[PDB]
Every structure is written in C-alpha cells, then in structure tokens.
Amino acid sequence: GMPLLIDIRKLTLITRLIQDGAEQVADSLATLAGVDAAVEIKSLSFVQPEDIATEMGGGTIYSARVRLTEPPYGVFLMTFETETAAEIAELMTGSSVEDGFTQLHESALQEMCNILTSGFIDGIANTLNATINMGTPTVVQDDATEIADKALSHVRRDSLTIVLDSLVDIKESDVAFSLRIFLIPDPGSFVHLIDQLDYDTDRETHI
Template sequence: MSKFENLTNEELDILREMGNIGVGNASTALATMLGRPINITVPEVYLLKFSNLDKVIKPDEIVVGTVVGLSTMDNDNSGFLYMIFPQDSPNKLAELLIGDSSDESMVESTIMEISNILASHFCDGIANMLDTVLIPTPPSYAKDYSVAVIDALLAQIADKTDNLIIFETDLVDQDNTVNIFLMLIPTEKFFEYIMQLLEMVK
C-alpha cells in the first residue's frame, strides 16, 4: 500500500469530497428525523499507523459508540463505519426523539435506530459516487473506551496492513447540543478500489 503515504492534495480533496457526500446524505436524514437543522464540518482525512490511532481519538475517553460493517454485493468486507456519540449526546438525542432519557435501554434503542439511519444513508451516498453498492450490517452498540470499542474490528484489517485511513466528520445540531463523530475505516482492498476510481478521474 505505497499509495498511502504519497497521496497528492488533489487525491485527498477527492477523498474528502467522498466523505462529504456520505455525511451530507446522513445528516439530511438525521435532520429530517430530528426536525432540526444539522451542520456538518468539512471531513478530515487521516492516514496513519495503527499505533498512532490515539492521535485521532482520545483513547481514554468513554463514549457511546456504534459500529456497522460494510460489504459489497459479493459479500466482500469493505470496512467499518464507526459512529461516536460523546458525552451527553446520547441522552440529548433520546430527549429530542422520544422526549425522555431516563430509561437507559430506551436511550440505547434510540442510538441504534439513529445509527441505522446514518449508516444506510452514508452508504448510499458514497456508493452512488463510487458506482457500487455498499450494504451496512445492523449496528452493534457499546459504551466503553473509544479505542476499546473498535479494536476487535481493527484486528480484522490489521493482518493485511498497518495503515489506517480514517474519514472523520462532526455532525452538530443548531444549538450545539448534539455531537456525532463519523469515522469510515475502509479495508485495504476497498481503499484501493477508491484509489483506482481516483486514477480514472484524473
């Protein structure tokens, strides 16, 4: 994966645009669901070694996180979408959607449902751009250290590569009360597929 280290600014821009389309789609769905505007930040693209993951996420922060696996039509694992709901965001989302956050299992169900919707719209967005089909698995839910939530998933791609590519975007509602971080973690193979398309664009 020599490509990894020497991406041009132009290629990074296209990757950012891909993240933008996915997250844009997801945020529209979330805004409709919540009945309030959702702003998104310009996606960051990080290329890093596994051992430097703590440069992107605070490893000792305890978060609510959900993960979906992504696969193509022929069942190829394409990577993971990791959705992080820091601090009060899960409770705020439950209050906005069902008017109550006192029951933890209801908060969990709310987060699962939101993750489902974010993931399917995110996948539609980038799959359209890439002219493929991406199918998300149902989400898995955990509340733990931000790294502990995903290390079992990272282990699945760690055998092939030491390099991680992460797209990170922040979804924020108008009052700044709800924050969601989305991270797309593609497999080496899916990343190469994306890069091939970039070659064709140039």
C-alpha cells in the first residue's frame, strides 16, 4: 504494497488517536483492575525499528509484545523498568516484592500489560469504528538488545516506529507507572488507517 505518502495536515490524527487510546486505558484500568488513574500518553519520537533498543532503558526491562492481525498490522510493544514493575506487582497483589518477585507478582505484570495494551488498542478501534484483533502476548524480561531482537522478528524494517511515553498516575495515591510503548504498524496500512479517519471526519461536514 500500500502507498506510503500522506498529506502532512492529517498527522494531527495520530495525536488524536493516541489520546483516544489513553482515555480507554484509563477506562479499562477502572473496569478490569478497579484502579482509578489519570493516564497521560504522548509521542516521544519517531524512530526506525532497529533503534528501539536505545530507547528502552538500561537494566532489566519487562516487555509484552502483541501482533496486530488487522489494520494497521505490525506489532505493539509495551515496556517498563524495575521501579514500575515493582509498583504494578505490589498494587495488583496487595503484597510486597521486597523478598523477590513471586508467581503472583509475575502473573500480575503480565495481566497488567494485557489491561494496558488492550485498553490502548481498543481506544483506537473505537475511534475507527473497526476491530483491531491482537495476537497472544509474548513476554520477554531481559536487556534491551534481547527484547528488541525478539520484538522485531517478522517486522518490516522500513516501518515507522512511534515511541510513546506513558504515565499512569493513581488518584489519591503516590503510586505512578512509567511505561514506554512502541507502535510498529505496517506503514502503508497505517497511512490508510489515518486516511480512513480523515475521510470519516471530513464527512461530518455533510451532517
């Protein structure tokens, strides 16, 4: 394949979709996890897929990847560092990680990734009035290089990568989660998706 050219004025829709994703993340956190939070998500940068290792942080990173099996295809990678992993695990289990991460804790990390990821993708799907099916998440806990190596398996190298920084700020609490999200859609399918939203939005001038 699909064409890769887009009108530059339509890039505002990327920002609109990201905010729609953040709003649904907040809604999912309340519905599924009983967590009441402000969720701020912002585009940090646009990078090439192979550059993602340098964008993650420097120790042991937790990551969950899903493949999109409907437009815009490609992959979606959620990552976070140890401080955030601890906050998630403690909040979602009512137990301390002081003595090491138990299975209750690791399972909470995986499920929290599923709530955050499906919330974000569902937000976008809602705005587009279309489903965006997601594959089974694959979890990798390791250094950046290894995460990137696994995450870029079967991914078009000339894709645009959108790097998002997200803060999940729990209300009436000092708990916060810091996440770094990598959107790696097929670039042609992504162009077409943005064009579709632009068409639907232009048509509101017919109402």
